Every structure is written in structure tokens, then in C-alpha cells.
RNA sequence: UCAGUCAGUCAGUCUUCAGUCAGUCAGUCUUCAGUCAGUCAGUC
RNA sequence: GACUGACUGACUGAAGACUGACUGACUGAAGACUGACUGACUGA
């Protein structure tokens, strides 16, 4: 029943015919099935006319790829056309060009195509017809859709100067919200709307001015509601002054109260300013109380146990890796640590002090779902991924909330370091559990704010977030649901509702603004659409040359050193790396300089001091340990000065790769 | 020099004690949507003794006179804020008299 | 031409030839044949090109032969088109 | 009416850096379970 | 003629750990350039 609403037909219409255009609906409208039918419009006709049509869709979160698939193309072209669902993570066992070549409609994960087209057999843009392109407001600077669309557009460009051709695929793209880049002038937002106009190559916005009211009963605001809550304990105070003592240890001037982010900033660079001086007896003293604040921010976010467990484990395994090198002021640290954590277990033990935050979230959650009466799904929206994964912790414990029949789970992307990290299969039925509804509130991250299509959403949550425009737009889009309610919640302590109030106003430049651009002259559209259309590819340029001078080598020129202590550890010549993908060293007086280290599959490498340097692996049946640049301090032989590197992309050495000889 | 992140009118719209240079509000005056002087009901302009020849101060008290006296020819109106200046020296200029 | 009524700069090719860039750099300062200073580079909307400080010139009308010099842009009546960008 | 010097205010154009976080992609390895089929060896 | 034990491969399913790079948003800091306006001083 591919029978569109009236005013869907009404903004499909210049897209039935070319007219390669964008279309905005606000959200919950429906958008798949306007790709859908003219989909198969485009198939059909094409194949009237006999000429080889295909189509691709491009979308940018992987959970949608699997939800787009089996909910909206699947049920509908059963019969008539041959759709492919392909991610990153399918294990493929055929080559991406004859899986075009097979199906005819595919939908896919952008970087999968931009992958498949820099291998220049590969593909070409020109196979395709129709190239749909889903949640197209990413298309900005360096995105992954900018580069697809920038050969598309260099291709047009040589076209126009073959004219004075190859045909282009007809594009579509849609969009709820293209959002401003941060500008307080109605000439600013228009021209930002002209940007991405043109860098999609459209030729009109084509919005809904028709069929209102229809459109006002389709669509619902939720019901905003505030929850924003400003006890003492001395928990906070009591991490205070031990970490004052620890400060005043060494001396430094803070510049700034603690538990701030400038804080953290500082603390962060002064210490590797200490490291570049080789100054001991400072450097660790300063990592330790970075922890702390870290530990404290956490700590004002979630409840107390996760908080010290944090710090726990990291002073656990601290002397664990300590007490390696036996088979003055790093017990100065411990010493006085362990007293007080001993203390603070007993501190933090106490369920009777709670944080304020925590507070309103359960009234919130009480209060909504005994309103409702077993008729709710909620959805809460986090920052941090632990942040999630404890919160679920939280949901577990206090059995006062499965009394009230809600059941919570953690969705979260793949891929730290931490607890556990949940696989793409696990994620994937997580969702199908939450949609038949004996999962009955999701606490969610970044990964799931664009293209959820539950058909009951009552609850749409946001905890202590902070973000553009557009991550709020879709955040109060996902309530797909009658008497939606969207609940913000915050302390008053940081910039939190005025980060709201900003973002309201911005979201009504964004509509006026849009319906200036909705109305301007076709010539000059045309000519200020061609000049923005010039300025990326000379920018582009620009920049090629700027990365490609800016890379400028010696492979032995520079050697190696510890931070904790200073002792040299190889020079350049004793490295060599795996597929031009891992940096390792075979060196055998090396091997004997560190320590391995287990818990083991793979063995930990530990310097004289206790700082670690690198992992065991077995590649191509030779045993063999790596180093991470992180670990190790550069020094070269023309200046001799002291640097760090994060990666290893920015050290301009290049090296041999592996005699396997040996 | 502090990073807005929304227009003055709207600025001015949300709190209702501003504390500001004069050069924006004048900037913001001259862009004729803007804002009109009678949104205001107090203002406090401190150091006023610099009301002199087209200074920053003389352009702003010159669209409150303007409009006084456009009202006087009203009466023979739109309300006109209340206006307050501190001083500590209004000095003379340059007078030997 | 100027930029946004805010900058004037020459795209002439052979006034490219004419001068000579100097630097000590992400600018490079425009040297005469004298010595003399002229403009600095300036790179915008993608583009690159050099730009001109009007104390550094000498400016001569058609009607009249006289030599004058201004400190500043707003005194010199003329007016400017704006930047063809299609260039 | 003008010039010169100095100080102050405001607005554009850029280039660039660090830190944390989240998402996407590709490798090298290692390990396990289950079923089925095949080859081989013993004592009767 | 029947019994048992072990080996190997293919298929399927699952997934525990490692490291690498690109990208975005946020915050913080930030070097240069240029433009115009205004006042004070001095001078004719
Ligand atoms: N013609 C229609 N009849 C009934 N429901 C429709 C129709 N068009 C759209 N919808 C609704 O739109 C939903 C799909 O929306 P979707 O496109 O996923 O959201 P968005 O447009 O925000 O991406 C479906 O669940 C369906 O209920
Ligand atoms: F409008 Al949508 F996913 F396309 F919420
Ligand atoms: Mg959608
Ligand atoms: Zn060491």
C-alpha cells in the first residue's frame, strides 16, 4: 500500500521528474517511505525506458542500516526488486563491485563506498542512478559525505567544460534540521543554508506550504518539562584536602579551584611540562592528582561507589606494578592513600548520602512511569559511555525501581579500556528486546539520537547534556509517541538551561532563515549556488598543498626514552613495523632491558620504574613485543630537545618495515 | 569582546539589568530589526561627563531628545526611560570666563 | 576590488609580475623595485592574493596632474566594484 | 576649516594548536562449541 | 559379520582480547593582518 499521504505526494512532486533536490519535514513524518515510492518510481520508469537504473542509500549510523533494511525497504519490494543490507561488520565474502553488480538497491554505511572509491579496480559514481542519502545535514567540512560529493562535483565541473558528457546520478537528500554554523546574523544562517545547498548540488529546499493543519495533527510537541536541583558531605571536602596536601606537597599554584575542566587542562599540560624536564618526584605526583580530579568529576555525576572504585583500581594495579620490579615519593602517595580510601570505602559505603542529580532523575522516573501505568517507554540520553553502564548499575540495585515493572538496559556503540565493551550483536537484539517491550527504559549515548522509529516513545530524557542544535532537535524528535513528554534535567551549577535558551533561539533563526532562502530569485540562486560551488575546490587545493608540503627523514636520526625515568631506550634504527600498521622492536639486548608482565595471552612490558611501554604480540609465528609512542619520550641528534607524540601519524620518521629473515 | 552566542535584542529580551559598553548598544541602535530605546525604562550611564561633541553618549541622548520633542509636538505620546549620569568633575570647556 | 567594503586588493596577473613578495611565512609583505613596501598577502574565500595600503602609493587623476597622497580610504572619492568571484 | 601625533572603542578575514568524549572503518592473532562427512588402528 | 577408540579437514554458529588511522561535536587557550569611528594634545 504504497499510498502516500497528501502533502508527502505534494514535496515528492519536482522529484519525480530529475530535479535532483532536498527534502525537509520536521520529525516523525515519515521521510523513509518518501524515499520508498520514488524509489520505485525510479526503478520502474528506467526500466520502461530500458537503461541500467540502480539505487544506493547511504546512511551513517550502523544500528540504522539493519533498521532501514528490514522495516521500511524490505516489506515493501519484496516482489519486485533484489535489496541488499550491508554493513562494516557483515562479514562479506565477495567483493563490494559485484555486490553492486548482483542487487540493484542497496543500503549501505558511507565509509564502505568512499573506501571503495579512492582504490583506484573499484567503482565508479557514474554506476550509479540514484544515490539517496539519509540524515544529509553532516554534510560539512571534511565529512564523509563532502567527499563523496565533492567528485560528483568535480565531475560536473568537467562536464561544464566539456559543454563549451558523462551523466551524474541523481541525488536526494534529507534532513530535519540543517541548523546554522553558529551564527548570531540572519546573513550568516542564510548563507550557511546556501553551503550545504550547494555542496549537496540541490536545486530547491522544497518545504511543505500546503497542507498545514493535517500536518499539525500528524505531527505533536511534546510537553517540556524542567528538573533542575541545587546536600552537603564531606565526601567532596574530604578528597579535597587530601589532594591540597598533595598539591602543597610540590607546591603548585592550582590558578584555579578544582573539579573545573581549566583545571584538568592545566594539570594535564604542566605535567607534560615536568615530563619534557625529566623532573621525577613531580610528574607522578601530578598524574595522581589529575586522577583525582577526574575521580571528582565523576563523582558530582554519578553516585559514589563507582567513583572510588575508579581510583581503587588504579592505585591497585599501581603497586601491583610496583612491586614487580622487587622480584621515596611514590610511597608518600600510598602511604597516606590507603588510610583515608580505607576510610572513604567506609564513607562511601553509606547509601543515606546521595547526589542531587541522581535525586530527581528517580522522582522523574517514578513519577512518569506510575502516571503511565505499564504503558511507557522512556529513553534516556547520557555523555559518557560508563556513565551509561553504571546508571544501568544503579537502575539494578535499589529494588525500588523494579517494583514499578521498569526494566533497563544500556545501549551503547562498539568498540573502552574499562568494564566491558558490548559487541555489535549484543546491541542489536538489545534494540529488538526494547521493541517488544519487556526492556522498558534504555539508557542510550550519542549513538542513537538520529533515526530511532519506536512507535511509543512517552519518555525522552536528558541527563546533564550539553550540544548543538541539531542533537536536540533529533533528541526531542525520537518521543514518536501521543502526550510525548521531553524532561531536561541539570543543576544550576554549570551553564546547562542557558545552553537551552541559546539553542531555542538559534532553532527559530533556523526556520525564518529558511524560509528567506525558501524564497529568493532563481538567477541569482543559480549564481550564488555556482560561486560556493568554486570556493570548496579551490579550498580543497589549497589545503592538498598545505597537508602535502606540511609532511616533511632520517630513520635513525632520534632515540628513545622513558618519563618515569630517562634511561635510553633504542634508537631508530631498532624499530620496524606489521602492514604499516604496528611499531615494534626485535632487538634481543632490548629484550632483556624490560620486564613482561600478566595478570596471560599477551604480556604488559614494564619499565625499571613501574611505567609500561608496550603489549607481547605473536605475528606471523614470531614472538615479539611492541612499543606505543605514548610510553616514550623522542629525542633527536640535530637539537636536542625533549618531545612527546600522542600518535604516531605526527612523527615525520618513516620506517623499514619487517627483514622477516630473521 | 566576550563570544555571544545570540542576538543583542534577545539578549536584552531574557535578563533585565545590562551591563554594557556604549558602543553597542549604538551599534545595535542604527540597524534599521534592532531594538528601540523606549524597551528601556532606567538608564544608568555612568562617567557621563564625556557627553560632548558626537561622542559615543551624544548620539544616543540625541535620538531621546529627538523623540522628546517629536512628543512635545504630539501633546500640542510614547513614554521616554527615565535617564540617570554620574559625574565627578563636568569640567569646562577650556574657559576663561 | 574590495572584500566586503572592508578591504581593497588587485587580482591583475601582470601587476602579480610587477612587485616582489618578501617574508621574515603565512603573510609575505609586497616589496617595490626601490625597496618600498606596498601590501601584504591575504588569502580569502579560497583565493590568494595581495592586497594594498593606499598610504603606500601615490594616487594621479586624468583631468587634473596633480600628485596627491591619502593616509587613509575614505577620502578618496572614488568608489569600487566588488569581487567578480567567478574568476 | 584642516593637518599631525597619541590613546580608546567596535567590526571583519584567516591560519593554526591542545585536551577529553563519542561515533565510523580496516588489520594481525588466539580460542571454543555442535553436527556431518572421510581416512587410519586395535582386540573379537 | 558386528564393536570400540583416536586423527584430520570442510561447513555453521558464536565471540574473548590487542593495536592502528580517519571524522565530528564540546571546552580551553591562542598568533597575525586589516578597516573604520571617537576623544585628548600640539601646530597653522
Ligand atoms: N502514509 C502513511 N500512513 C501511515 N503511517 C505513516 C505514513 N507515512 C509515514 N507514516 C509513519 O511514519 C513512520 C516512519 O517514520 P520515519 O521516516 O522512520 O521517521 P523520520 O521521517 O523522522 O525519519 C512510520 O512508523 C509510520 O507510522
Ligand atoms: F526525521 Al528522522 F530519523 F528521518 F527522525
Ligand atoms: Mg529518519
Ligand atoms: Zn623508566
Given amino acids: 500500500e504504497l499510498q502516500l499521504r ?63 533494511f528490514r522495516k521500511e525497504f524490505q516489506p515493501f519490494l519484496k516482489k519486485w526488486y533484489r535489496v541488499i543490507g550491508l554493513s562494516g561488520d557483515t562479514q562479506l565474502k565477495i567483493s563490494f563491485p559485484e555486490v553492486v553488480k548482483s542487487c540493484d538497491i542497496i543500503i549501505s554505511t558511507a565509509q564502505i563506498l568512499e573506501n571503495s572509491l579512492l582504490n583506484l579496480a573499484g567503482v565508479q559514481l557514474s554506476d550509479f542512478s540514484l ?121 603548585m599554584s592550582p590558578m584555579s579551584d578544582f573539579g573545573t575542566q581549566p583545571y584538568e587542562q592545566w594539570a594535564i599540560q604542566m605535567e607534560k611540562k615536568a615530563a619534557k624536564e625529566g623532573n621525577r618526584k613531580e610528574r607522578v605526583c601530578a598524574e595522581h592528582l589529575r586522577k583525582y580530579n577526574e575521580a571528582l568529576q565523576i563523582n558530582d555525576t554519578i553516585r559514589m561507589i563507582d567513583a572510588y572504585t575508579h581510583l581503587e583500581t588504579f592505585y591497585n594495579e599501581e603497586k601491583d606494578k610496583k612491586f614487580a620490579v622487587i622480584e621515596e615519593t611514590d610511597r608518600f602517595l600510598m602511604t597516606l592513600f590507603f588510610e583515608n ?110 533515526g530511532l522509529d519506536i512507535k511509543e516513545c512517552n519518555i525522552v530524557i536528558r541527563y546533564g547534556l550539553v550540544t548543538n542544535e541539531i542533537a536536540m532537535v533529533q533528541a526531542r524528535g525520537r518521543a514518536r509517541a501521543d502526550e510525548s513528554t521531553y524532561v531536561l534535567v541539570a543543576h544550576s551549577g554549570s551553564g546547562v538551561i542557558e545552553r537551552e535558551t541559546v539553542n531555542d533561539f538559534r532553532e527559530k533563526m533556523m526556520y525564518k532563515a529558511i524560509h528567506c532562502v525558501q524564497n529568493m530569485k532563481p538567477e541569482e540562486y543559480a549564481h550564488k549556488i555556482l560561486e560556493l560551488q568554486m570556493q570548496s575546490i579551490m579550498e580543497k587545493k589549497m589545503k592538498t598543498k598545505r597537508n602535502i608540503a606540511k609532511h616533511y627523514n632520517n630513520p635513525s636520526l632520534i632515540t628513545f626514552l622513558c618519563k618515569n625515568c630517562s634511561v635510553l631506550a633504542c634508537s631508530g634504527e631498532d624499530i620496524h613495523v606489521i ?84
Avoid at 580 to 591: A, G, L, R, S
Fill in 131 to 251: 544515490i539517496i542519502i539519509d540524515e544529509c545535514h553532516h554534510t560539512n567540512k571534511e565529512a564523509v559525505y563532502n567527499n563523496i560529493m565533492r567528485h560528483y562535483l568535480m565531475q560536473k565541473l568537467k562536464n561544464n567544460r566539456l559543454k563549451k558528457v558523462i551523466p551524474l546520478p541523481q541525488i536526494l537528500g534529507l534532513t530535519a534540521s540543517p541548523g546554522v554554523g553558529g551564527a548570531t546574523k540572519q546573513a550568516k544562517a542564510e548563507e550557511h543554508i546556501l553551503k550545504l545547498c550547494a555542496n549537496l548540488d540541490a536545486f530547491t529546499i522544497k518545504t511543505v506550504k500546503e497542507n498545514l493543519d493535517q500536518l499539525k495533527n500528524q505531527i505533536q510537541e511534546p510537553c517540556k518539562k524542567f528538573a533542575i536541583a541545587d546536600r552537603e558531605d564531606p565526601f567532596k571536602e574530604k578528597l579535597l584536602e587530601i589532594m591540597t596536601r598533595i598539591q602543597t606537597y610540590c607546591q
Fill in 341 to 450: 580510601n580505607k576510610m572513604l570505602k567506609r564513607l562511601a559505603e553509606n547509601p543515606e548520602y546521595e547526589n542531587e542529580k541522581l535525586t530527581k532523575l528517580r522522582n522523574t522516573i517514578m513519577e512518569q512511569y506510575t502516571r503511565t501505568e505499564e504503558s511507557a517507554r522512556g529513553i534516556i540520553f547520557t555523555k559518557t559511555r560508563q556513565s551509561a553502564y553504571a546508571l544501568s548499575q544503579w537502575i539494578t540495585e535499589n529494588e525500588k525501581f523494579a517494583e514499578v515493572g521498569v526494566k533497563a538496559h544500556h545501549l551503547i556503540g562498539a568498540g573502552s579500556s574499562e568494564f566491558k565493551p558490548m559487541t555489535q550483536n549484543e546491541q542489536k537484539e538489545v534494540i529488538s528486546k526494547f521493541r517488544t517491550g519487556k526492556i522498558n527504559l534504555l539508557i542510550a549515548t550519542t549513538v542513537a539520537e538520529e
Fill in 579 to 662: 602492514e604499516k600498521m604496528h611499531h615494534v622492536n626485535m632487538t634481543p639486548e632490548f629484550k632483556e632491558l624490560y620486564i613482561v608482565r600478566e595478570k596471560q595471552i599477551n604480556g604488559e612490558i614494564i619499565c625499571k620504574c613501574g611505567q609500561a611501554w608496550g603489549t607481547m604480540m605473536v605475528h606471523k609465528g614470531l614472538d615479539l613485543p611492541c612499543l606505543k609512542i605514548r610510553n616514550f619520550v623522542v629525542v633527536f641528534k640535530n637539537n636536542s630537545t625533549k618531545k612527546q607524540y600522542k600518535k604516531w601519524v605526527e612523527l615525520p620518521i618513516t620506517f623499514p618495515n619487517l627483514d622477516y629473515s630473521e
Fill in 6 to 68: 497528501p502533502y508527502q505526494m505534494e514535496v515528492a512532486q519536482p522529484a519525480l521528474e530529475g530535479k535532483n533536490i532536498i527534502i525537509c519535514l520536521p520529525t516523525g513524518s515519515g521521510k523513509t517511505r518518501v524515499a520508498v515510492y520514488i524509489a520505485k518510481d525510479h526503478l520502474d520508469k528506467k526500466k520502461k525506458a530500458s537503461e541500467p537504473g540502480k539505487v544506493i542509500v547511504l546512511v551513517n549510523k550502523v544500528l540504522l542500516v539493519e533498521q532501514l
